[PDB]
Amino acid sequence: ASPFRLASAGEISEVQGILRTAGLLGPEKRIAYLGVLDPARGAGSEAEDRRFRVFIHDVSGARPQEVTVSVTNGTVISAVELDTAATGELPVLEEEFEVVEQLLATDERWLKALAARNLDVSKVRVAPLSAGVFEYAEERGRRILRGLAFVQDFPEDSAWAHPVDGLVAYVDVVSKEVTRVIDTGVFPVPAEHGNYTDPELTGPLRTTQKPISITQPEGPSFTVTGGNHIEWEKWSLDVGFDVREGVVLHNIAFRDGDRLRPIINRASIAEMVVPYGDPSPIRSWQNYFDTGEYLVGQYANSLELGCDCLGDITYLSPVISDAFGNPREIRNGICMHEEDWGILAKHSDLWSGINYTRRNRRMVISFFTTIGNYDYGFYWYLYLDGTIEFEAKATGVVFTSAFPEGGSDNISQLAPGLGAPFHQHIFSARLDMAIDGFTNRVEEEDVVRQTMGPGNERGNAFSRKRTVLTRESEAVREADARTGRTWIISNPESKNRLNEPVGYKLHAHNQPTLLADPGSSIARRAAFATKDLWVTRYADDERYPTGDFVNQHSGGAGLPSYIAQDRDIDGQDIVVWHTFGLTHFPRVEDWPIMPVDTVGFKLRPEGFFDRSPVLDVPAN
Amino acid sequence: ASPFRLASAGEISEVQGILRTAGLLGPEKRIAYLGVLDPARGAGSEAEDRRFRVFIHDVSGARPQEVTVSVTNGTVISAVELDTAATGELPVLEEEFEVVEQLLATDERWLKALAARNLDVSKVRVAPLSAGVFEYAEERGRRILRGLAFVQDFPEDSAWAHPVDGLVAYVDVVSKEVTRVIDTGVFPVPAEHGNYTDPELTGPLRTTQKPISITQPEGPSFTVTGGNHIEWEKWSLDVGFDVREGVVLHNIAFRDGDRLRPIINRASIAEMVVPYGDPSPIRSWQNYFDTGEYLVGQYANSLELGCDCLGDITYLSPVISDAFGNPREIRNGICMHEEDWGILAKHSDLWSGINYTRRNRRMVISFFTTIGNYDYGFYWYLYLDGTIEFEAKATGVVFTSAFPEGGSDNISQLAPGLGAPFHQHIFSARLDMAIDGFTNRVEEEDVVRQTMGPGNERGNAFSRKRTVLTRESEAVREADARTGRTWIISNPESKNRLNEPVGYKLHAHNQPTLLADPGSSIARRAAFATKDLWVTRYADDERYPTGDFVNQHSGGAGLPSYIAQDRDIDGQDIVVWHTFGLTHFPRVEDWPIMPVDTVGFKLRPEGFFDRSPVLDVPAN
Numbered sequence A, B: 001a002s003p004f005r006l007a008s009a010g011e012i013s014e015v016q017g018i019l020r021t022a023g024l025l026g027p028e029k030r031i032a033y034l035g036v037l038d039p040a041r042g043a044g045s046e047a048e049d050r051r052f053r054v055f056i057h058d059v060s061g062a063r064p065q066e067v068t069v070s071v072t073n074g075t076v077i078s079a080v081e082l083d084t085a086a087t088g089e090l091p092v093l094e095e096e097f098e099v100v101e102q103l104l105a106t107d108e109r110w111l112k113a114l115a116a117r118n119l120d121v122s123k124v125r126v127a128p129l130s131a132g133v134f135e136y137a138e139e140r141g142r143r144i145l146r147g148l149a150f151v152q153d154f155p156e157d158s159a160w161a162h163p164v165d166g167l168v169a170y171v172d173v174v175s176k177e178v179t180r181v182i183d184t185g186v187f188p189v190p191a192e193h194g195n196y197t198d199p200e201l202t203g204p205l206r207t208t209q210k211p212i213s214i215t216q217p218e219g220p221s222f223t224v225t226g227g228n229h230i231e232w233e234k235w236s237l238d239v240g241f242d243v244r245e246g247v248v249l250h251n252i253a254f255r256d257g258d259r260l261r262p263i264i265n266r267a268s269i270a271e272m273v274v275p276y277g278d279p280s281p282i283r284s285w286q287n288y289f290d291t292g293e294y295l296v297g298q299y300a301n302s303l304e305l306g307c308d309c310l311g312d313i314t315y316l317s318p319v320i321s322d323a324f325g326n327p328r329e330i331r332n333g334i335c336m337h338e339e340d341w342g343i344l345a346k347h348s349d350l351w352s353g354i355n356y357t358r359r360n361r362r363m364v365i366s367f368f369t370t371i372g373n374y375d376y377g378f379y380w381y382l383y384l385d386g387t388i389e390f391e392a393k394a395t396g397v398v399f400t401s402a403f404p405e406g407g408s409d410n411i412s413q414l415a416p417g418l419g420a421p422f423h424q425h426i427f428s429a430r431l432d433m434a435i436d437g438f439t440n441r442v443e444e445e446d447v448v449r450q451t452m453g454p455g456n457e458r459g460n461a462f463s464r465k466r467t468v469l470t471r472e473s474e475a476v477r478e479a480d481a482r483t484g485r486t487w488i489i490s491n492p493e494s495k496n497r498l499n500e501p502v503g504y505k506l507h508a509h510n511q512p513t514l515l516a517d518p519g520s521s522i523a524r525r526a527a528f529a530t531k532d533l534w535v536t537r538y539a540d541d542e543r544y545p546t547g548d549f550v551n552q553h554s555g556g557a558g559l560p561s562y563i564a565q566d567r568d569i570d571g572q573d574i575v576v577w578h579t580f581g582l583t584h585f586p587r588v589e590d591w592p593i594m595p596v597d598t599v600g601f602k603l604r605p606e607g608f609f610d611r612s613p614v615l616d617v618p619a620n
């Protein structure tokens, strides 16, 4: 009965039928995005209406359309034709990936380049990569993919070990034309294989690891109701899934005595960009928007018990649409479980004689996606003490190139002749805040050093200062680790028992933001990534930090255009957008398959409760 | 047979007998520190000689002594009389703690101050705190403790809830004189209790937590030999224990094929300081040097199975000396166990069809100490992939004061009338490096941004730069999170298969360093805490960043004096000293007992291996 329930297979089938009967889903049409719309603000009238947003691509060259459908009422609410040279192209379709390699295999320029290198065309895999927007006037308004080549010596070979450097092609995937083939010179194809299951590379497998058995003999402590409503250790929330964003958390609330207290209305990773820092023209255009261009949710893995998720696991299997409107289940795509998390609180008191220890635990909600060579795990954690944490885990195989003799300032060497270009992995968390309700504000908190002198005669004092962000034009903030800078989201109309506004503190990891020159194409298209924190006034249509149509958009969409409205954010319905990421200079140890590296953020209560919220946790 | 074995009860008994027969341990003498000396550099001749260092205090006022003893040969090697006004006082003795409260209970000024507040002297507990060095000329060369008072309403009451503000006393614990009683005015004693086991405060305990069972049905994967030698998943090390530093890790090495490769010769937390930032004269002198002044190892907790350490636990029970030279065992003082640590590496490859997942694990070595109101957990972690990590966990009860009406810039309010002064918890990790042997160097690595222009026409390139630290005078470094600053310890004479020097990268958390005015007493005594990273040339007698005798030392000892030697550190036997810490503005949620907060650092391999070191990890 919940309006936040997961989309069902029947709902997706109904959308398909509604679109087809409306004449909007003929043989030339493809669904590039389909997802459920959240309830509008103030749905406290039970006026339940399940609406879906659909992006419809046309493979014959006709204008694409954005369509909204009500499955409740069985009607098309609106259908708009899109001018893609203006507002951006639709996300890449899975079926366009194969088109790139197939088209290049019959192009005389491509074949001549492979012949010069003595490569058999049947062994050459082509990575189909998003195009961005650069200097090529003929690409405006066309759907372009760019291809980089790798050699597969045999069907089970890791092609990433054998990049074909000095060669790139651009393909129009609608007209099926190869627009440009660029060959800047012959590089040796690195010859060592990178097959991490080959016994000659692994050596004999270890026999020293003894099993670790994690079980819950009475079952887990959380309950799942309505398909996706979670209750666990005073937390309450709904787990959503969207094909673009992946796992979305709705209605995060905490049961404080008799009150269910809201904290976060909606939490998601709303964009992620992987910009490459190699100035070679073979790769200098390379920037993945995994969320906005490719849709990370549709490439979610089925997670295996005992390998991907260990313990007493509860799975959700979300349903998405394929390109024709048929429902497709991602079996075991979301793992949920609780984990022991060490000591929660401990004290041995000499004067009272009391020894006290309690253990911590966390609830884990996770999924994994694979886009080409990289694999990413997205982890949301809820802790007993009110902390909320996000962690991204990056693994997979690094993107490779030739390593030029005489070295490089922008590429690491991984193996003889084998390079890995420098890059970043940057995420944007969109946190539609609801600290004790919707009247919230953000304060920036800095440590304050004090000078020795009157009123501080021993020079030991230090303090802190808080600055309220009152309008969007002043709410674009940078980290400052040296001053211990954090941000507090508070509710000025809800006070704790000390008459102070209740709040939550955002702790960032303070990693570098986007490194590209601010005049670059990527800085314009990923402007969110140039600053650590943005605060906007909530609006229904301001969903993504990069805009709705990221693929081949010329720039400026999303957060820079939203904040130009300069709206009041002091005690209002607000959204926090936090940029965080990893700067990856690949190491030899990242090859031939990369051990996990992590990055994230957390929010801790700051006078939200009237005392520690875990005094009622029992012993042993 | 190992020279790195733990001190035995028999060794300590022999030291006691040697000291006594030498006439050095009469009825007026107390052992303030006793510990084993590490082998000197180049012990590759098996010339085994177990030597102990002893600090001997005299309760009658005679000069203390530093003594070195050989238990192997049964002789006193050297005995030096100490001039404590010059080189510092000896660490605080456990038996001096009770002296402070007992002396104040008969002092007319103390009793008059308690009478004005209608407090019964029998209910007033006194926290005995280290004195530091300030303006009081009469304290030079005397052993002083300062006392702050708290009310215990009944024997099981948490006295921390009832600070008696406006009152402080100074005590000479050798002459048994109260030197000063300072009363700056009557503050109400906060009345709410902070008894976190009282059902009226906790409410009914949760019945919702279901058990998590962690077992190892075939036992753990690590072996312990020789009492304290650990082998686990290619790691090899020795676990030492010292009464001042606590757990010390020796001879950290990694079995890479047929080679045992050294990484770290000795790792320890060599100092920790807790400076308070309240300018009130009641507390403006307050700075704990838990390691150097109190000796954190002697207050180690006995860790309980299922509560403190969960899983298949192996315990060590180190032996220390009491004040009379008798051996005392700290039963179950060190926990060792392995833990599942999620996904290690994962990739699903479209072209090869291979799906690959491996799980991570870590070896944990931990102990917990309690000094007054605070409790600290020290955790060392070894990971499958070569990462070494340290984590400090802070919990216990925060130090309290009155909360003044009209507020404070330097104190948080926790409850009606109850404050908690701002403070920091700062640690110094001493890492005697041995990356593939003893010829090491440190490079500072910064991200480098590049301008759009020739050779970077699309403005996407970024790079990095490394700066070798060649002499101690240039090896005092600050963090810079915005430039992604890290430090690499490498061996210029040991190269990986790509002919690059092998190395390890130190990743800091980039938290604020010491906030006090640089002209303050604490900045002079804890100069190590003002900078993130120091590198020195190894020397036998340069053990602690604060010097040997921290208590009431006037300043400048330790690292600032060591680096004045300006020694060559470019490809030499070097020691890295890393400062890291937490800046604590107490929150309501920290009361009445504080949930754990953490801080730490890690070291990751950087071209140390020729490829990923975990290719031989098996599945499932």
Ligand SMILES: [Cu+2]
Binding pocket: A394, A398, A423, A425, A584
């Ligand atoms: Cu990467």
Ligand SMILES: [Cu+2]
Binding pocket: B394, B398, B423, B425, B584
């Ligand atoms: Cu603290």
Ligand code: NA
Binding pocket: A085, A086, A087, A088, A553, A554, A555
């Ligand atoms: Na445009």
Ligand code: NA
Binding pocket: A265, A432, A433, A434, A438, A538, A572, A573, A574, A575
């Ligand atoms: Na909001």
Ligand code: NA
Binding pocket: B085, B086, B087, B088, B553, B554, B555
């Ligand atoms: Na002195």
Ligand code: NA
Binding pocket: B265, B432, B433, B434, B438, B538, B572, B573, B574, B575
């Ligand atoms: Na060294």
